[PDB]
Symmetry: none
Subunit: 116 residues, 2 copies
Amino acid sequence: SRWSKDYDVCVCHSEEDLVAAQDLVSYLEGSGAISELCQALSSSHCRVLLITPGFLQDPWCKYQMLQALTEGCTIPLLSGLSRAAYPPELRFVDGRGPDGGFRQVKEAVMRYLQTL
Amino acid sequence: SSRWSKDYDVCVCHSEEDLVAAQDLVSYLEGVSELCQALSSSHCRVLLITPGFLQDPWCKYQMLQALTCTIPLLSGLSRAAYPPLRFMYYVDGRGPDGGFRQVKEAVMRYLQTL
């Protein structure tokens, strides 16, 4: 049912996290292959929450987190933020994993294609 | 910390179309107020909860940052429709001057603490 939507993935980042959001994109797309920068109104099956310091500080994007958990696929890549400050809503992917955490998000990215 | 630690004393937050009426709150004071500037610094933070204030999500959840000084006034809405603010302090836009002397009264109540 994938064709009902246009993109496999969507990496959401705040300001300045861009060069690094481009690095995940290429990772997904570079290896029914897998990527887009979010970037808005992006019919995308999955979404990537690149949780970082400026992002924590940039709360607009922060409202965005809710919409995602609001009303499905979404993968929070928290990179560079202590395992302290990192909302708890989550207590319920790590930036310490393989490739800095890029394998899981795509690693965990796949199962969904079987879902589609 | 001090009465010299946050640039303005007050900051009126409102919806897109509630602007004309949020600047009229600001004028009430003084007589330092400020129409809240995306990310400006202010001691007191004033939300302008209206019927249309509770229809748009962006401002929606910007109230939520509420509770959690912050003085909320509600106007343009029935006793009901008010967000399930049951459990706290707020100012009904029903009092003298539309719930305006009251917000002034609450701020000044807060300013002595500083």
